[PDB]
Amino acid sequence: WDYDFLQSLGRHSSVTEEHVGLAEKLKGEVKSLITGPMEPLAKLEFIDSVRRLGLKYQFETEMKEALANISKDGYDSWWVDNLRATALRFRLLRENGIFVPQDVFERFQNKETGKFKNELCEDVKGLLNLYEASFLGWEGEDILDEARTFSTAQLKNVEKKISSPNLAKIVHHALDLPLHWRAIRYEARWFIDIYEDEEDMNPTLLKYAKLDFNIVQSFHQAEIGRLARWWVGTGLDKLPFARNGLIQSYMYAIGMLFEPHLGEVREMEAKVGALISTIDDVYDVYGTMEELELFTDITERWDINRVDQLPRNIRMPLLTMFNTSNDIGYWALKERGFNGIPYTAKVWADQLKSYTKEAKWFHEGHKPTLEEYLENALVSIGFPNLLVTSYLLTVDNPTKEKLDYVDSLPLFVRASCILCRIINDLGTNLKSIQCYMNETGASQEVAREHIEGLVRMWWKRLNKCLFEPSPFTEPFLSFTINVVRGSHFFYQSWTKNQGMSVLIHPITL
C-alpha cells in the first residue's frame, strides 16, 4: 500500500455501464418510494435508512419535502404516545431544519423527579432513538441533556443483555459514537452491511446503496491516483515527514466531503492536508527556531527570496506549500472568477504563526491556560485554512467581503475549529487536557470529563448555528459540520483497514 500502488489506482474500475444504468433505475425507484405514500412513522424510518446509507446527497430535495409534509400535520396521534416515534421525529425534523421543541419529551419524564421513567429501560430501540435524538439539542435544553445521560447509562446496562448480534453491534456502535458525530462516508460503509441484516430491510434501497457506493468509490479511486501522482511529483514523499500523510489526508478529506461533483475541491483540500502533515513535522521536530522563524516570515511576506537560505529538507515543503497555494488561488480565479491567492497565502501564514507561538512557548517553558491555548490552537489545527479554502472554491458569487467574513472566523466556523482541536487533543507537549490540569489542578480523568463537556457544548452551538440565519449556504455548512464529524471518527493500524474497506475494496454484488 505504497505510492507505486496509489498512483496506479483509478486505471481499472470495477463498475460497468450496466451497473450505472441499474443504479439510475434503482434511484428512480427509491425516489418513488421516498415521495410515494407510506405510513408516517414508516416513512421516517425509511428516510433515516436512506441517510444512513450515505444516499442523502442523491435525494436531498425529495427527503426535505417528505419531512416537511410529515412535519406540518395537524395529527400527532401516530407518534406522540411512544418515545421511539417521538425521538425519531424530533431528530429527523431537527436534522432537516424543522424545529421540534424539547417539551415533546416532558410526557416521558417524572414531573416530581424530572428524571426519565424507567418503563423504557427495557426497549432497546426506544433507548437508541432517544440517545441519538439527544445529540441534536441546543444549549439550555436540559430535558435533552437528561435524555442523553439517561439513555447512555441505560444502553450501557442493556448492551450485555442483547441476544441479537446485529442489535448488539448497533448499540455498541452508537455508544462508541452517535450518528450525529459519525463521518458520513465511513458510516455509510458500515451501515450497508448492518442494514443488510435487518428484518424490515428494503431490497431495492439496499441494492441501490451498494451500487451507488461502488460507483462513487470509482471516482474516489481515480482521485487517489491523481493525488498520489501529484505527491510523488512534489517529492515530499521521499521526505521523512510525509510518511503515509498523503493518504491519511485524503481519508480526512473524504470525511469532510465525499460527493463526486466536488472531486476537484476534495483534491485541493487533500493537498492542503498533506502539506499540513509535512510542515507539522518540520515545525514540531526537524526545524530549528531560526529556520522556522524564517519559514514563517517568508510565508507572511509571500517572498521566496531567502528560501535558498533554508536547507533542502525545509525549503522543499515551503515551496510546495507556496506553489500549491498559488495553484489553488489560480484555480479559483479560473473557475469562480475570483483570485484566491491572497486568502490561501494568508491562511497558511496564520497557521505558521500559530505554530511559531506554540514552538516559542515550548522553548520558553510557558504553560498556557485552556482559553489561551485554545485561542491559538483553533488556528493551529489547520481547519481554519481548510474551511476558508473550501469556502473560496465553492461559494456562489465570491467577493472580497465574503472571503474576509469567513476569514474572520465567525462563531459558526470558530465552533467547528475549536471542536476539531479539542477532539484531536482528546484522542491522544501541553494539550487541552494538560492545560486544564495545570489551570485547575484537577485530576486527569476529571479534566478529560471537562473537555468532553466542552465538546458537547460546542456541538450544541453548531446545532443552533445551523438554525440561525447565516451568510453561509450549502455545501459550506456541510463542510463545517463534516470536518468535526471526520475528526470524531478519526480520533477515538486500524486506519489501513478503514482505507481498504472504504476506498479500495468494492462491495461485492
342 binds its own copies per the rule CB under 8 A: yes
103 binds its own copies per the rule CB under 8 A: yes
**Contacts by 234-239 with C-beta closer than 8 Å and gap 24+?**
234/316, 234/320, 235/316, 235/320, 236/274, 236/275, 236/278, 236/316, 236/317, 236/320, 237/3, 239/278, 239/313, 239/316, 239/317
Residues 465-484 that bind its own copies (CB under 8 A): 468-469, 471
Stretch that binds its own copies, among 6-14, 296-304, 344-352, 392-400 (CB under 8 A): 392-400
Pick one of 107, 117, 156, 238: the residue that binds its own copies (CB under 8 A). Answer: 238
409 vs 151: CA distance, rounded Å:
35
241 binds Mg ion per the rule CB under 5 A: no
143 vs 133: CA distance, rounded Å:
11
Q: Are 458 and 415 in contact (CB under 8 A)?
A: yes
- Which among its own copies, Mg ion, none contacts residue 355 (Cβ within 5 to 8 A by kind)? Mg ion
**CA-based radius of gyration for the chain:** 24
Over the window 168 to 207, marking each residue x when it contacts its own copies by CB under 8 A and - when it does not, the resulting string is xx--xx----------------x-----------------
3-state secondary structure 185-217: HHHHHHHHHHHHCCCCCCHHHHHHHHHHHHHHH
- Which among Mg ion, its own copies, none contacts residue 248 (Cβ within 5 to 8 A by kind)? none
- Which among Mg ion, its own copies, none contacts residue 464 (Cβ within 5 to 8 A by kind)? its own copies
- Which among Mg ion, its own copies, none contacts residue 160 (Cβ within 5 to 8 A by kind)? its own copies
The number of CA neighbours under 13 Å toward the Cβ of 290 is: 4
73 is in an annotated binding site: no
428 binds its own copies per the rule CB under 8 A: no
- Cα separation of the two ends of the chain: 25
The DSSP secondary-structure symbol of 139 reads: T
- Which among its own copies, Mg ion, none contacts residue 204 (Cβ within 5 to 8 A by kind)? none
How near is the Cβ of 281 to Mg ion at its closest, in Å?
9
Coil, helix or strand for 421? helix
196 is in an annotated binding site: no
401 binds its own copies per the rule CB under 8 A: yes
Q: Are 158 and 474 in contact (CB under 8 A)?
A: no
Over the window 404 to 423, marking each residue x when it contacts its own copies by CB under 8 A and - when it does not, the resulting string is -x------------------
Stretch that binds its own copies, among 199-207, 253-261, 400-408, 416-424 (CB under 8 A): 400-408
Residues 204-233 that bind its own copies (CB under 8 A): none
Stretch that binds Mg ion, among 47-55, 124-132, 223-231, 281-289 (CB under 5 A): 281-289
How many residues of this chain interact with its own copies, rule: CB under 8 A? 72
Is-cis flag, bond preceding 475, omega within 30?
Answer: yes
Pick one of 62, 145, 293, 327: the residue that binds its own copies (CB under 8 A). Answer: 293
497 binds its own copies per the rule CB under 8 A: yes
Q: Are 254 and 292 in contact (CB under 8 A)?
A: no
Cell numbers describing residue 85: 416515534
Beta bridge partners of residue 116, listed in sequence order: 109
- Which among Mg ion, its own copies, none contacts residue 28 (Cβ within 5 to 8 A by kind)? none
Pick one of 4, 18, 37, 305: the residue that binds its own copies (CB under 8 A). Answer: 37
How near is the Cβ of 489 to its own copies at its closest, in Å?
13
Pick one of 208, 219, 355, 373: the residue that binds Mg ion (CB under 5 A). Answer: 355
**Closest CB to its own copies among 203 and 469?**
469
Angle between helices 444-467 and 411-427 (to 10 degrees): 150
280 is in an annotated binding site: yes
How near is the Cβ of 363 to its own copies at its closest, in Å?
5
Largest CA distance in the chain: 74
Pick one of 9, 15, 23, 40: the residue that binds its own copies (CB under 8 A). Answer: 40
Q: Are 394 and 400 in contact (CB under 8 A)?
A: no
**Closest CB to its own copies among 98 and 319?**
98
160 binds its own copies per the rule CB under 8 A: yes
376 backbone dihedrals φ, ψ, rounded to 5°: -80, -45
Give every CB contact of residue 374 below 8 A, 6+ residues apart in sequence. Answer: 418, 421, 422, 432
3-state secondary structure 15-66: CCHHHHHHHHHHHHHHHHHHHCCCCHHHHHHHHHHHHHCCCCCCCHHHHHHH
137 binds its own copies per the rule CB under 8 A: no
The DSSP secondary-structure symbol of 408 reads: T
Annotated binding site: 280, 284, 358
Annotated binding site for Mg(2+): 280, 284, 358
| Residues engaged in binding Mg ion (CB under 5 A) | 280, 284, 355
